[PDB]
Design an enzyme around this catalytic site. Structure first.
Site, PDB file in Angstrom:
ATOM      1  N   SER A  80      32.954  19.965   6.921  1.00  0.00           N
ATOM      2  CA  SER A  80      32.193  19.242   5.948  1.00  0.00           C
ATOM      3  C   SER A  80      30.716  19.388   6.206  1.00  0.00           C
ATOM      4  O   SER A  80      30.327  19.892   7.260  1.00  0.00           O
ATOM      5  CB  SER A  80      32.624  17.763   5.909  1.00  0.00           C
ATOM      6  OG  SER A  80      32.545  17.155   7.187  1.00  0.00           O
ATOM      7  N   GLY A  81      29.893  18.986   5.226  1.00  0.00           N
ATOM      8  CA  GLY A  81      28.420  19.130   5.318  1.00  0.00           C
ATOM      9  C   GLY A  81      27.737  18.927   3.996  1.00  0.00           C
ATOM     10  O   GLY A  81      28.446  18.696   3.036  1.00  0.00           O
TER      11      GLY A  81
ATOM     12  N   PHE B 168      27.510  20.545   0.996  1.00  0.00           N
ATOM     13  CA  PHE B 168      28.616  21.230   0.265  1.00  0.00           C
ATOM     14  C   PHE B 168      29.994  20.493   0.107  1.00  0.00           C
ATOM     15  O   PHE B 168      30.884  21.021  -0.571  1.00  0.00           O
ATOM     16  CB  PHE B 168      28.869  22.646   0.840  1.00  0.00           C
ATOM     17  CG  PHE B 168      29.617  22.668   2.170  1.00  0.00           C
ATOM     18  CD1 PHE B 168      31.027  22.501   2.217  1.00  0.00           C
ATOM     19  CD2 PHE B 168      28.914  22.872   3.390  1.00  0.00           C
ATOM     20  CE1 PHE B 168      31.706  22.492   3.428  1.00  0.00           C
ATOM     21  CE2 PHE B 168      29.599  22.873   4.609  1.00  0.00           C
ATOM     22  CZ  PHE B 168      30.998  22.683   4.622  1.00  0.00           C
ATOM     23  N   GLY B 169      30.190  19.322   0.737  1.00  0.00           N
ATOM     24  CA  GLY B 169      31.459  18.531   0.584  1.00  0.00           C
ATOM     25  C   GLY B 169      32.459  18.673   1.748  1.00  0.00           C
ATOM     26  O   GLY B 169      32.033  18.856   2.919  1.00  0.00           O
ATOM     27  N   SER B 170      33.774  18.602   1.450  1.00  0.00           N
ATOM     28  CA  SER B 170      34.788  18.539   2.521  1.00  0.00           C
ATOM     29  C   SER B 170      35.829  19.507   2.201  1.00  0.00           C
ATOM     30  O   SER B 170      36.240  19.574   1.072  1.00  0.00           O
ATOM     31  CB  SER B 170      35.326  17.111   2.627  1.00  0.00           C
ATOM     32  OG  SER B 170      34.268  16.231   3.058  1.00  0.00           O
TER      33      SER B 170
ATOM     34  N   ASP C  29      22.016  31.739  -0.122  1.00  0.00           N
ATOM     35  CA  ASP C  29      22.243  31.098   1.175  1.00  0.00           C
ATOM     36  C   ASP C  29      23.087  31.966   2.131  1.00  0.00           C
ATOM     37  O   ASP C  29      23.942  31.511   2.877  1.00  0.00           O
ATOM     38  CB  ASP C  29      22.879  29.701   0.974  1.00  0.00           C
ATOM     39  CG  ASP C  29      22.659  28.784   2.205  1.00  0.00           C
ATOM     40  OD1 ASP C  29      21.674  29.047   2.965  1.00  0.00           O
ATOM     41  OD2 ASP C  29      23.467  27.845   2.425  1.00  0.00           O
TER      42      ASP C  29
HETATM   43  O1  LIG Z   1      38.426  28.683   6.730  1.00  0.00           O
HETATM   44  C1  LIG Z   1      37.342  28.076   6.096  1.00  0.00           C
HETATM   45  C2  LIG Z   1      37.252  28.207   4.710  1.00  0.00           C
HETATM   46  C3  LIG Z   1      38.150  28.938   3.958  1.00  0.00           C
HETATM   47  O2  LIG Z   1      39.201  29.551   4.580  1.00  0.00           O
HETATM   48  C4  LIG Z   1      37.999  29.056   2.603  1.00  0.00           C
HETATM   49  C5  LIG Z   1      36.909  28.465   1.999  1.00  0.00           C
HETATM   50  C6  LIG Z   1      36.019  27.775   2.760  1.00  0.00           C
HETATM   51  O3  LIG Z   1      34.911  27.159   2.256  1.00  0.00           O
HETATM   52  C7  LIG Z   1      36.184  27.623   4.107  1.00  0.00           C
HETATM   53  C8  LIG Z   1      35.232  26.883   4.818  1.00  0.00           C
HETATM   54  O4  LIG Z   1      34.148  26.318   4.095  1.00  0.00           O
HETATM   55  C9  LIG Z   1      35.289  26.732   6.197  1.00  0.00           C
HETATM   56  C10 LIG Z   1      34.294  26.019   6.913  1.00  0.00           C
HETATM   57  N1  LIG Z   1      33.268  25.494   6.182  1.00  0.00           N
HETATM   58  C11 LIG Z   1      31.920  25.059   6.677  1.00  0.00           C
HETATM   59  C12 LIG Z   1      31.235  25.723   7.945  1.00  0.00           C
HETATM   60  O5  LIG Z   1      30.521  24.727   8.807  1.00  0.00           O
HETATM   61  C13 LIG Z   1      31.071  23.357   8.962  1.00  0.00           C
HETATM   62  C14 LIG Z   1      30.615  22.646  10.232  1.00  0.00           C
HETATM   63  O6  LIG Z   1      31.655  21.671  10.457  1.00  0.00           O
HETATM   64  C15 LIG Z   1      34.443  25.897   8.310  1.00  0.00           C
HETATM   65  C16 LIG Z   1      35.522  26.514   8.993  1.00  0.00           C
HETATM   66  C17 LIG Z   1      36.491  27.245   8.275  1.00  0.00           C
HETATM   67  N2  LIG Z   1      37.584  27.842   8.832  1.00  0.00           N
HETATM   68  C18 LIG Z   1      38.044  27.715  10.221  1.00  0.00           C
HETATM   69  C19 LIG Z   1      37.269  28.745  11.001  1.00  0.00           C
HETATM   70  O7  LIG Z   1      36.651  28.067  12.079  1.00  0.00           O
HETATM   71  C20 LIG Z   1      35.275  28.369  12.320  1.00  0.00           C
HETATM   72  C21 LIG Z   1      35.288  29.401  13.416  1.00  0.00           C
HETATM   73  O8  LIG Z   1      35.212  28.824  14.736  1.00  0.00           O
HETATM   74  C22 LIG Z   1      36.379  27.351   6.867  1.00  0.00           C
END
Ligand SMILES: O=C1c2c(O)ccc(O)c2C(=O)c2c(NCCOCCO)ccc(NCCOCCO)c21
Length: 272
Positions: A14-15, A16-18, A134
């Protein structure tokens, strides 16, 4: 029909939503389920057929056709206080920020492969009429088995146009000097700058500029060993004058970009 057709799992981020991990009951397709509260959406558009949606959905729908290095929108849903997006989810996957955090600076051969797939994905968006705005390591996912990169958060994106942009909602440390100094930029050349930040991040293990004054001054220091070729492409993308930056084409014909590895070979060598 949303609560029935997907099974929810753990929170991914989360941060863009959850965003949650999820399964399409219909057929066990892994998915990511993303909730965005209406109240926090600043920026709206309309689908060709015509309802009022969050720009992210307009953008995702314009780029989710066919294959590419963009995580595809599979379906979406309105709720009374939120929108919910259903996205592809490769399996297993790690975002590039955490990959770089865990492993430090990437070897050039790996950075070259990754950076190349980023360029291909961003060309693909620019082609579909979409500007991401971004591009950075946390908006990129790695499918660890196939070695394929996928771009993710379109929430600060826009329709691509050839006139100046006077709004920016992305990440400051990745924003070009013309934005810092004049509050104006153009899409392509701003995106090139962010590409140059990203490439430095990949090969040095960290972003090159932290404060406004360093962005504006644009002098790049290397704290890690990087080939002259890699350094020159980076300084090129990070030229202070937008018009002195390379186009995508020139970035892909640069000598450092020769003999890229295919994704599959990249994962054999570098990810298993
Ligand atoms: O797998 C997604 C994901 C997806 O498969 C499809 C669409 C997505 O938007 C995501 C996704 O947004 C996602 C993550 N999102 C935010 C990154 O930073 C968040 C800090 O808690 C943060 C982590 C994340 N996946 C687990 C990978 O873990 C991060 C690597 O150590 C994802």
């Amino acid at each position: 029909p949303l609560e029935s057709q997907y099974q929810v799992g753990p929170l991914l981020g989360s941060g863009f939503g959850s965003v949650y991990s999820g399964i399409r009951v219909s057929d066990n397709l892994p998915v990511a389920i993303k909730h965005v509260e209406k109240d926090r959406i600043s920026d709206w558009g309309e689908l060709p057929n015509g309802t009022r949606v969050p720009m992210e959905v307009v953008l995702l729908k314009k780029v989710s056709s066919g294959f590419s290095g963009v995580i595809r929108l599979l379906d979406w849903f309105e709720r009374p206080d939120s929108f919910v997006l259903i996205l592809e989810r490769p399996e297993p996957v790690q975002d590039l920020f955490d990959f770089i955090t865990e492993r430090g600076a990437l070897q050039e051969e790996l950075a070259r492969s990754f950076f190349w797939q980023v360029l291909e994905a961003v060309r693909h968006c620019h082609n579909c009429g979409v500007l991401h705005r971004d591009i950075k390591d946390e908006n990129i996912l790695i499918d660890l088995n196939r070695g394929e990169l996928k771009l993710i958060d379109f929430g600060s994106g826009a329709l691509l146009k050839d006139t100046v942009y006077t709004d920016f909602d992305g990440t400051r440390v990745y924003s070009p000097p013309e934005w810092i100094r004049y509050h104006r930029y153009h899409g392509r050349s701003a995106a090139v700058w962010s590409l140059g930040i990203l490439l430095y991040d990949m090969v040095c293990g960290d972003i090159p500029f932290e404060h406004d004054e360093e962005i504006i001054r644009g002098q790049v220091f290397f704290r890690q060993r990087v080939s002259s070729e890699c350094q020159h492409l980076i300084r090129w993308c990070l030229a202070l004058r937008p018009s002195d930056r390379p186009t995508f084409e020139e970035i892909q014909n640069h000598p450092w970009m020769q003999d890229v590895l295919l994704p599959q070979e990249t994962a054999e060598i570098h990810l298993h």
